[PDB]
């Protein structure tokens, strides 16, 4: 049941808890090998420097991930990288450091087809979360198979990443590997929802109180708890107002004035009471629950909550030992959540908002189903097929190519191709508009059929949109296409495909590009070549034509590096289907007509000379 949902059984849970207990005594991490399983548990810390990095000047101790070391932990189309607690990241980096045995041990267990588990209590649980991502980027994305799948099991961990971090876990379908146990009133999962400044004064004392080392105060506990829940209230109210799209103008004006914690639940959360075990997938539903499950129902319980909130950080022993006697269920899948939430202490109003977060996910799934139906229908795919199988053959038969035909001609097939370009722009701009406002499931940008579709669309129609831009002289209104003219739809398509083809090899598209340029052994220095190629069309084959339009009107020594760059990219573009060799070398092609006008010396030594005549 629990196992069915999480791919994790009670034995694994209990061993993870023992390892986590074990890691108090070790420094950094403790390794437990047992059967098919190797467990890496991480040592918690209880000093403020390990929650809010003293040199971090931001308000929530946050930092953006390194794009080269975590290339999936980002929005693909938009580009924005995920953000995480810098103290937790720094701890992971000290553990990863080659002067420890951690990397070797992980590599060995991978070499032995072991099931790897990362685990931890308190901030070690947070360290576990980051370690899992490290492992998923080092190993899994390179050779995904079932033996290589990790597990991450935390107990009362604080929050770690932001919404982009959670979303990227969802896109790669890595979220399934994460389980986070939370005892109802445990304060630590809530701490990082507060501004640093709100909890600065009292955090050292409360961390000391949470450290299982010599307890010897109610004011400090109660103040700290009050401040965490005040900030958490702001965060939860704003978040649920925002994700439902209510009161957008009000929220956007208020937002300027607020500092709200970026941290979000990542992975599945399992809430534990005396009678229930509740698993929840949705990040935002979990966030609401973090607020509403720790509320006081009357005065006595208010008197009690702060103290219980410190002590419940150490109820995970009784949690794991009572697992099998608790009633289990899965909130997201339940079709009446009232009883579950009542048992968790969630008021009628709290329930309205947990329900709102779940329901917003259901709307995202609905939007995605609508989009899938439109793009699988043949009235749709036949516009692409018409440009592929009628327009291009007819224009290349005319000996000018479909780019130039669209750019200058006025026949009925060019007008037809314009109409179809506009219609496809509609479909893909709608999808983009939905993604920009977080209206589609996290997985959508990673979906292979959508990537294939949008890549066909980009390769086929971006040339027509470049033709469109230049025919109506918008390049002379608002500048080169590659700077301000290029539609964001094509950028999203390019990034989705680049990530799809490059992530199994651990490569970055920008590095692939600059290494190719360096292999061209051009006659400039590094910084000059970097200046010359800024905002060039040679980073993407479907931008071929835009680059040509920027070069054709210029003297050859002004452009020699850019010309050689383009020619250097052409052969792989042709092999991969980014550029059609039936098109670009035609007698009427703008490119062909321009290239035969390049100095005899260049043409004689060009890798394209066997393609064109003077």
């Amino acid at each position: 049941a629990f196992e069915a949902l999480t791919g994790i059984n009670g034995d694994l849970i209990t061993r993870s808890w023992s390892a986590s207990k074990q890691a108090y005594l070790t420094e950094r991490y403790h390794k437990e090998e047992a059967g098919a399983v190797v467990i890496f548990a991480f040592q918690p810390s209880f000093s403020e420097k390990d929650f809010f990095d003293p040199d971090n000047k931001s308000s929530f101790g946050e930092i953006k991930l390194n794009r080269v070391q975590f290339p999936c932990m980002r929005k693909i189309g938009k580009g924005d990288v995920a953000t995480v607690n810098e103290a937790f990241l720094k701890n992971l980096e000290a553990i990863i450091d080659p002067r420890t045995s951690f990397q070797a041990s992980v590599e060995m267990a991978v070499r032995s087809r072991k099931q790897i588990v990362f685990t931890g209590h308190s901030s070690g649980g947070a360290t576990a979360i980051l370690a899992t991502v490290w492992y998923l980027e080092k190993y899994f994305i390179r050779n995904p198979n079932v033996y290589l799948e990790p597990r991450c099991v935390t107990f009362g961990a604080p929050l770690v990443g932001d919404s982009i971090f959670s979303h990227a876990l969802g896109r790669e379908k890595w979220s399934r590997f994460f389980v986070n146990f939370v005892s109802r009133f445990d304060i630590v999962p809530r701490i990082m929802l507060a501004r640093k400044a709100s909890v600065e004064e009292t955090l050292p004392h409360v961390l000391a109180q949470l450290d299982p080392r010599k307890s010897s105060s109610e004011q400090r506990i109660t103040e700290f708890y009050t401040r965490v829940m005040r900030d958490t209230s702001t965060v939860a109210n704003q978040a649920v107002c925002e994700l439902t799209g209510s009161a957008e103008a009000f929220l956007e004006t208020l937002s300027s004035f607020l500092e709200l914690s970026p941290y979000r639940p990542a992975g599945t959360f399992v809430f534990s009471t005396e009678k229930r075990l509740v698993a929840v997938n949705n990040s935002d539903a979990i966030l609401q629950m973090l607020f509403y499950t720790s509320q006081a129902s009357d005065e006595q319980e208010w008197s009690l909550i702060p103290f219980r909130s410190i002590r419940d950080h150490h109820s995970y022993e009784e949690l794991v030992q009572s697992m099998g006697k608790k009633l289990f269920n899965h909130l997201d899948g339940e079709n009446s959540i009232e009883s579950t939430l009542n048992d968790l202490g969630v008021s009628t109003r709290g329930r309205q908002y947990v329900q709102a977060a779940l329901e917003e996910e259901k709307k995202r799934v609905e939007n995605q189903k609508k989009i899938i139906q439109v793009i699988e229908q043949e009235r749709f795919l036949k516009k692409l097929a018409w440009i592929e199988d009628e327009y291009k053959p007819k224009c290349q038969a005319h000996k000018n190519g479909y780019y130039d035909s669209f750019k200058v001609s006025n026949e009925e097939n060019d007008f037809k191709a314009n109409v179809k370009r506009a219609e496809l722009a509609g479909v893909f701009d709608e999808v983009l508009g939905l993604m920009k406002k977080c209206q589609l499931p996290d997985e959508f940008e990673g979906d292979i059929d959508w990537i294939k579709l949008a890549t066909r669309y980009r390769r086929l129609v971006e040339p027509l949109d470049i033709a469109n831009y230049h025919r109506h002289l918008k390049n002379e209104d608002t500048g080169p296409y590659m700077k301000r003219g290029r539609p964001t739809r094509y950028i999203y398509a390019q990034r989705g495909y680049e990530h799809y083809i490059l992530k199994p090899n651990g490569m970055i598209a920008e590095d692939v590009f600059w290494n190719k340029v360096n292999g061209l052994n051009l006659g400039l220095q590094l910084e000059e070549i970097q200046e010359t190629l800024k905002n060039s069309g040679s980073e993407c084959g479907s931008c071929f034509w835009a680059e040509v339009e920027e070069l054709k009107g210029k003297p050859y020594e002004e452009v020699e590096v850019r010309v050689k760059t383009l020619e250097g990219m052409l052969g792989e573009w042709i092999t991969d289907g980014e550029v059609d060799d039936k098109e670009i070398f035609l007698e009427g092609s703008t490119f062909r007509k321009w290239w035969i006008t390049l100095p005899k010396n260049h043409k004689s030594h060009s890798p394209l000379r066997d393609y064109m005549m003077d």
Partner: protein, 519 residues
């Protein structure tokens, strides 16, 4: 299936530090009897004291002369008016001349006030937001127990200018002052009605007025409830520790009706009493149901695509005119309206006009998101449309007129003024070296201006007066002539403007000949 957000919006506001910090600042200003300006946690609060002496209740129009103007608001003769005592107190306290420099360099400004202090704060925030440029800081205005400020015309003007969400008026449900202004006054901005049990936001002037009437049917009137905002701010901002479930019996299963019932309870009424039923109906009829504007905006891309063939038809028509031997340019071709090609493209002109009219109405009525007009896609789709089509709408106007105003003289379609304003949501340097005439004349009203210059050249043909012909030439002809010649010089006209038999080439010839005639 609706989602009720009036109480949630209230809870968002109440949970912010702005709520308690603005009140704190109000309290300090009250105790001092002077305006207090200070920073809390990086936010600048300008808190205006309560003034018990001034005589409220007398409306007067906004100033039309002086240093204190509101160009961002209507001039249209259901004229906006404001409370005269508040306008006078604004000039009296030297708010403008002072606040100007004390705010220079600040980046987040809250203007706040209790009672008439809140009325003055709202006036002041309105003034800051009603200039030709937006202020160089974010502005937010929170009032506590403010009397009403102006009339209905002011309120709908504030709504029309999209400034209403910059205001949050906290009104204790037992505070008589906000509910007790004379009947010519109207609320504007969002109202946070609040009690000992919670808060509820209403953003619609009709719903606020309804709530005023409802509340005026309830009971105890002691004046000093106006003096208890510190108690309500404290209680509200501390409710986050307590779990708050529905206290009546039957929470109505249905998700929307449940949120409504909880809002009624947050105002402290029971869903069984008469007053509670009225509050329920008021909250229920505040929302006005539509398709989610975020989704509406995304799917609108397909509707733009479906209407685009009409724009392509204008493009094809324009090319065909360029190729015609008569060389009229498509403006004068379409004005002449001889050929079947003219009748055909007119169908497309009408299709595009109806689409962009529909889009702009959706914007006005909030069927599209508040920031729809800032999306680059819509800025440029509308600009591309306007570039091609506005000349045809000009030509249709001049070809149908009685000879009968001028296009630019109250006869320009609204949608083109809106498109003009949308153009400011983007960049506008990037002057590129032009290698030929622009695809479309960059001033989309060029032909209207040319028609006016034509009329003026004719009336100066009548002439007689040889120094009054100069006025018409010095004032209303040569300026347009050099404007046009710079547009031609920078190549910001399309080639059809310089077609041999276009009305511009004809006018240029007539004028050069007339200018030889008289030095």
């Amino acid at each position: 299936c609706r989602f009720e957000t009036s109480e949630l919006q209230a809870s968002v506001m109440i949970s912010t530090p702005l709520f308690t910090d603005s009140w704190s600042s109000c309290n300090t200003a009250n105790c001092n009897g002077s305006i207090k300006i200070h920073d809390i946690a990086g936010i600048t609060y300008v808190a205006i004291p309560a003034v018990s002496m001034i005589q409220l209740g007398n409306l007067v129009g906004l100033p039309v002369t002086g240093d204190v103007l509101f160009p961002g608001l209507s001039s249209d003769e259901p004229l906006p008016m404001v409370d005269a005592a508040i306008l006078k107190l604004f000039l009296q306290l030297k708010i403008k001349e002072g606040l100007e420099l004390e705010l220079l360099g600040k980046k987040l400004v809250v203007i706040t006030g209790h009672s008439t202090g809140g009325a003055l704060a709202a006036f002041t925030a309105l003034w800051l937001l009603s200039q030709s440029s937006p202020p160089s800081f974010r502005v937010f205005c929170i009032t506590f127990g403010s009397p009403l400020l102006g009339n209905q015309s002011l309120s709908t003007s504030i709504s029309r200018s999209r400034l209403a969400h910059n205001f949050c008026h906290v009104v204790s449900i037992h505070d008589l002052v906000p509910r007790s202004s004379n009947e010519q006054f109207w609320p504007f901005g969002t109202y946070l009605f609040c009690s000992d049990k919670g808060g509820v936001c209403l953003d619609n002037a009709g719903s606020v007025r309804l709530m005023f009437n409802i509340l005026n049917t309830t009971a105890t009137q002691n004046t000093e409830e106006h003096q208890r905002y510190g108690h309500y701010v404290f209680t509200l901002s501390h409710m986050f520790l307590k779990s708050r479930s529905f206290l009546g019996g039957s929470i109505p299963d249905n998700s929307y009706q449940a949120g409504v019932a909880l809002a009624v309870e947050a105002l402290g009424f029971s869903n069984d009493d008469t007053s509670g039923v009225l509050v329920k109906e008021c909250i229920e009829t505040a929302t006005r149901i539509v398709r989610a504007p975020i989704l509406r905006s995304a799917e609108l891309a397909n509707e733009l695509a479906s209407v685009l063939p009409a724009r392509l038809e204008i493009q094809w028509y324009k090319d065909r005119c360029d190729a015609s031997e008569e060389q009229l340019g498509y403006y004068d071709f379409f004005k002449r309206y001889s050929l079947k090609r003219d009748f055909k493209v007119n169908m497309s002109r009408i299709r595009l006009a109806k689409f962009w009219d529909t889009v702009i109405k959706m914007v006005e009525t909030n069927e599209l998101p508040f920031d729809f007009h800032l999306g680059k896609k819509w800025i440029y789709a509308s600009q591309f449309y306007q570039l091609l089509a506005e000349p045809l709408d000009i030509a249709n106007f001049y070809k149908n007129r009685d000879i009968g105003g001028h296009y630019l003289e109250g006869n320009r379609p609204k949608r083109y003024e809106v498109i003009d304003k949308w153009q400011k949501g983007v960049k506008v340097p990037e002057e590129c070296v032009r290698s030929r005439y622009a695809s479309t004349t960059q001033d989309t009203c060029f032909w209207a201006k040319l028609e006016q210059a034509k009329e003026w050249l004719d009336e100066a043909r009548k002439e007689s007066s040889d120094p009054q012909r100069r006025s018409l030439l010095r004032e209303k002809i040569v300026p347009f002539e050099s404007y046009a010649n710079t547009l031609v010089t920078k190549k910001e006209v399309s080639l059809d403007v310089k077609a041999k038999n276009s009305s511009y080439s004809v006018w240029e010839a007539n004028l050069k000949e007339f200018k030889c005639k008289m030095g």
